[PDB]
């Protein structure tokens, strides 16, 4: 405490405790705090007095027909990794994943259409029998699929008209004569696209080796293409402070960051803690610690509900994810649910965690996952759970201060992975190494 | 009963389920059958009662220390699989890993060394900290290992003076200067080869799949390498069981075989028992189906342990795999110990199975394997399971008699997922195509 | 011209004809480009007056005993076709060899023992029989290729205690008790080996198939296993520009190369020819074009020799291959002669070309290959050619240029093959396709 | 000339020195007679003088602008070898091929379609940019012939929907929608039947092998699949009475048959010539030698014409196969053109023969020919000569009497070999062994 650091970190977020762990590894010396006596910030694991202490009151206790309070880890932030994506790659880089640590399968995958959860559908024969499709709509899909899965960069027989090196996803698509009703599912639910705005911006076989590492996940998962770690997302911050421990730092909880010391400059030089300061070369955060250079960028509304019984049309899926297109429900913004449960122990047996996330885009938040929170009911118990979002005014590199950015609504990590290469990217200003492997501590 | 088959097959070993599956589900009308009430033969899974039966006596009773008989799920034959390997990829193909059939990891992957059992190292670092190795051989071996896993056939710069896709791994080991103490564990408990014959006759490159394929299947759960089945490899035999139910056929239990029909140039067409004949184009068994078509190609020895407490210097692993090399040993062949325990509910709580097998060369085969005995004491009970081996004389292409090998002392499924494929492809006529997807019923 | 191509290919030897012609039936746009007016280089094809000019002065000129010089297409480096050995099948990817060429059979296969050459023997009944071994050895070297001929792998009777997928040829041979006598006919004339290290490296089974091969060609064209072209090998150049011209492309000769244009991590981007700049991706040569980029491997002596008459105990062969095994002739490589004439259409009536051809070991290159040609007198003319043979230091995948290795003292296309083969490989990163099929000029 | 034979062979057509041939490798004693004093009968070899003496009269004479007489080796009935088929297989296993006996290629492989003449297509390639095709079917063929060279019957990936093993060409040709244009040059000029039977009465497979025989053939040494001897098919019965010699028979030319002679039962016992008898256990001869055990089965036009010029459409190719498809002709039998010259040394520098023959159907048989005549025109010399063509009522294996059937009109030597392996197999009993070696002198 309070010596000399190449880089101090702030919060313990997913997004700080990875950057944290990156830099440990590649021979930094980090310090790394936290004003909260507890890990995670506004993504903590709470249990179930947690849970009420925090949305009910100071006094209020949890009736008993919800179970022991400490069967719970209610990751208040909820995402799935995709088994080989992005977030997993770099966690590997960390060597965190080596711990005793255990990543398990996601049950479901489901996508909604017309008041309705369906199954994912991946072949073209599923495509061509899936409920999402209409009778002549299931033809036109099921040609753009095989197109698709046939699809081969090398092999020119199977182009057909189309470069996708170089050709957007929009002329595909209107080749075959696809609805909303295909697109939906295949850019949101298969690709994992937030809105439709990637058919015109990215290459059609960038889309189409999304769907691939979809299928590729999801045939060696069985059931669905995701995993999510056991006891929950609160184990990361465990492993990464083990992590920290290894490499001679230590996590820091429960100490306030009175300020932090820049020079005439505007750069960072230190962070100062309790009358002590802490010099150092960066400073890593999320937007609590720097009110004065973040942006308000929106709200997510999260609803957390606990269940006494699987989702109806999920085949008695103990864990899934389901996306609610939002060209399906009338919005401009996607809304999530994933559902988790006894079987990843953040639940007592036979509860259910389904937590609802979206873009807020009224007055009414709540009113907003209705149509969600419908398909979930009966609910046990209910907590709603809205958050202002933000996002850094400049990248870091002229005041050495890097910030994230909030959680977005998805249920899926690529979006806080792409922020993690990112902000990397901006301290080290080199591209991102994928190959990079830790040092001896 | 009496009818037309394109297949016969007969025992409900594992070889032969996934082989009757294969067909099943590539379109052929197959039927299966076994002479026992139950299932697995010589490989099957007993509860406690059952065991004592088997070896102790009809009158044995077992004392109530050792808990509720039906808690014990003891699998005769024990074999962990690669979480990405051979057999798993097998079994997605036939479809039964999306049935009701759960994995769970293996906690542990460890190796014998001059009186010690040690983790298995598979990172540079793991490799140069590890206690297997001395003070220089541990950089010996980590310039070793980080050149394998670094190197790329495709890419030129990795090749540092050697080609792997020609240069076998004696020219490499005697580069880095390496001795047995790498090459066991390397070779033995990495790589999974059995004697270091390997060294000249295979490419290097076939080695560093090895080690590939354990670096990946750590990184699918964590922890280790290897999964195996939630009460243990009898659902394997239920699930494939009901597989064949699916596509029309049914498992007949109980059903003693008479004899084999041959027609006058020797080659199969039908199978008899109980008076009627079905006849088939094909047959498909074990060894002991054919005993005039096999020939004895040694003994195994299988010791059964029951533990109240885990293997001294595992860390407690609930479960685990434990290779002794066999120039460890002084021995001409490895000795492989399989632990498994409450957490694959093959055991009560507080219970540990520990299965201890190798080739027998001598006389006394139990004094053969007394060093690993006595790593486990104290040992509640004790059952030697001795068992001849066999091969088949022809590979079936003439008579249409598949035979599968008996299965060898390792405690993993490779060379029995070989076994299924070499005995497919003697049945087709076709290379084994590693993309191929269930028909519809 | 000066375009955007996707390889450029400097050179007009047969190795870099091929992979001009391979890219070019997979769709690649090629710069083909050599620097002399004539195809072959080293190897380039020369009737008479072109030999006397290069070996004897500008001003020499041939005897009118030696016959019309238009009616000689000298190979100068000359090598046999295997009949359905790899080249075979490489050339028939390219399409070339449906055009108007025609391959002819060679009529002789010999081998040389103790001062004598013989017909290759290849049947059991020919082994038992054959002036190249003793009488004991005969016995021996019978029953060991009645074994190889007789070896089924799915067949395990035919096994005879050997497993010839796993086991190597020294077991088999030790066992059966042959010497060299039986293993170099064996090994270096029917097999094709150029030295004995297979015997422990390969596996007996890759041995067996070779033989097979052999003796399924020889059953096919009868006399011998070998084919070569009509009016010789410099009619491969010729249908293979015309191949490039089907694909839009032309052969640039008498173009020198001014210089070759990398960029800063030292890949090709261009190549630069009289002011002009033609971008590629790659660029694929023989050792010449590229001489910072090769090392030397050794030297090669061929003696070419025109003859009024057949070689000697080769029953008045009009064309022959004859195999000198290193072990027969106290060496360390062994001597190729391959022997063509008017049959072929490279020499006038009554002429025949033998070209005597090894690896260099000594100070006095003429003398090693004495033995073949006191076989060979009276000889009407000779010239001695000698050349440097060079290898690439990298295989081109770093720097994206890709070169060929030269010629090899050998009267048989494999290793030549074997180059090809692996220089495309190195090309698309991709194993060889056997199968791979050409794709309709635009 | 009075002695005891194994078999005795009448006449020196190509069917018979085969047959004698063969029965003389094989270790039989065989005598082989000729009632003429010049070898091959009906299909004898003639100079021009000889020409002019048969067709014109004994006084006529040849005009000097011809050339020399003796330059001229005219085989009045030609046909053209597959450098790979049957004959030449057969032809090896005799061992005549390693005599002094030239076979060269011939140059051009044509047929007729349309009113024009032009290349046979055999690659994918060739097929998609023939002549003979319209656009739309030229990418129809290609598919079609891609096919068919890449179909593998051990490979069912190849099969895309079609057992070739039991299904016929025809329902592979509507498949692909090919008319006509594609089946005439594909069946009749590739595939080398007469008729379009084939595409009903034989499995497809039986098809696919021919067009592998062709394309190989091909591959031997270039330019066409057809060879032909120098000097024409008089070498033939020239080696075959040398290798007679050889294996212990005479070849008799100029001795008259006086009489077969029959025991009791009706079996052959010997053949009668000058009062002499050689008795033998059976007789293999042409029909001319027993008038009361054959049958007419038709005629046979044939028209010699020399040239002076190549014929028009054939790339001045100086010899040629040219096959015209009945369809094209408004025919029920094909017509076939033969084209040898001076590179066969049939015929003086500059001369040309061209052979046209096909089954006779009408009173008129010269106007049937007369849409290739008038391609040939302007024509030197020519020479009608038509033939009656006789088959056996029995196979001879009660009487002993084996007997050939006449030569068929067709320019290739397919139907010949098919007749010499029946003749085998019935005087053998057995399947015909493709893979008998010669035994030695």
Same mark, same amino acid.
């Given at each position: 405490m309070n010596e000399e650091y190449d880089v101090v970190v702030l919060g313990t977020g997913l997004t700080e405790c990875v950057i944290s762990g990156l830099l440990s590894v590649s021979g930094k010396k980090v310090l790394h705090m936290d004003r909260n006596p507890y890990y995670g910030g506004e993504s903590a694991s709470l249990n179930l007095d947690q849970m009420f202490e925090k949305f009910r009151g100071q006094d209020a206790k949890p009736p008993a027909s919800l179970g022991r309070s400490r069967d719970y880890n209610i990751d208040l932030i909820p995402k799935f990794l995709m088994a080989n994506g992005k977030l997993v790659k770099i966690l590997r880089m960390t060597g965190v994943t080596r711990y005793n640590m255990e990543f398990a399968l996601v049950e479901g995958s489901f996508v909604y259409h017309k008041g309705e959860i369906h199954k994912v559908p991946i072949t073209p024969?599923?495509?061509?029998?899936?409920?999402?499709?209409g009778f002549f709509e299931k033809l036109k899909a099921k040609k753009l699929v095989s197109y698709l899965?046939?699809?081969?960069?090398?092999?020119?027989?199977?182009?057909?008209?189309? $470069?996708c090196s170089k050709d957007t996803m929009d002329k595909i698509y209107k080749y075959y004569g696809v609805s909303e009703?295909?697109? &939906?599912? #295949?850019?949101?639910?298969?690709?994992?696209?937030? $809105?439709?705005?990637?058919?015109?911006?990215?290459?059609?076989?960038?889309?189409?080796?999304?769907?691939?590492?979809?299928? &590729?996940? #999801?045939?060696?998962?069985?059931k669905s293409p995701y995993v999510y770690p056991m006891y929950g997302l609160g184990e990361l911050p465990q492993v990464f402070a083990r992590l920290c421990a290894v490499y001679g730092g230590t996590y820091m909880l429960d100490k306030k960051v009175d300020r932090i010391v820049y020079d005439d400059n505007g750069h960072v030089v230190g962070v100062e803690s309790g009358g002590e300061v802490a010099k150092c070369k960066m400073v890593v955060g999320d937007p609590s610690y720097f009110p004065e250079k973040v942006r308000k960028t929106g709200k997510v509304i999260r609803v957390i509900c606990i269940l006494s019984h699987p989702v109806k049309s999920t085949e008695n899926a103990k864990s899934s994810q389901i996306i609610f297109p939002q060209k399906q429900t009338g919005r401009k913004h996607d809304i999530y649910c994933c559902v988790t449960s006894f079987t990843h122990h953040v639940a007592p047996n036979g509860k259910y965690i389904a937590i609802v996330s979206t873009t807020v885009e009224s007055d009414n938040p709540e009113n907003e996952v209705k149509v969600v929170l419908d398909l979930l009911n009966p609910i046990d118990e209910k907590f709603v759970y809205i958050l202002d979002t933000y996002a850094p005014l400049e990248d870091g590199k002229?005041?050495?201060?890097?910030?994230?950015?909030?959680?977005?609504?998805?249920?899926?990590?690529?979006?806080c992975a792409v922020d993690i290469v990112d902000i990397?990217?901006?301290?080290?200003?080199?591209?991102?190494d994928w190959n990079k492997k830790p040092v001896e501590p």
């Open positions: 024969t599923e495509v061509a029998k899936t409920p999402l499709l899965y046939d699809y081969d960069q090398n092999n020119p027989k199977t182009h057909q008209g189309f $470069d009703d295909t697109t &939906d599912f #295949l850019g949101h639910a298969v690709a994992l696209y937030t $809105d439709d705005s990637y058919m015109t911006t990215v290459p059609a076989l960038e889309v189409i080796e999304r769907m691939r590492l979809y299928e &590729d996940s #999801l045939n060696m998962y069985g002229k005041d050495g201060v890097f910030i994230s950015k909030s959680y977005d609504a998805t249920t899926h990590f690529e979006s990397y990217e901006r301290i080290t200003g080199e591209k991102f």
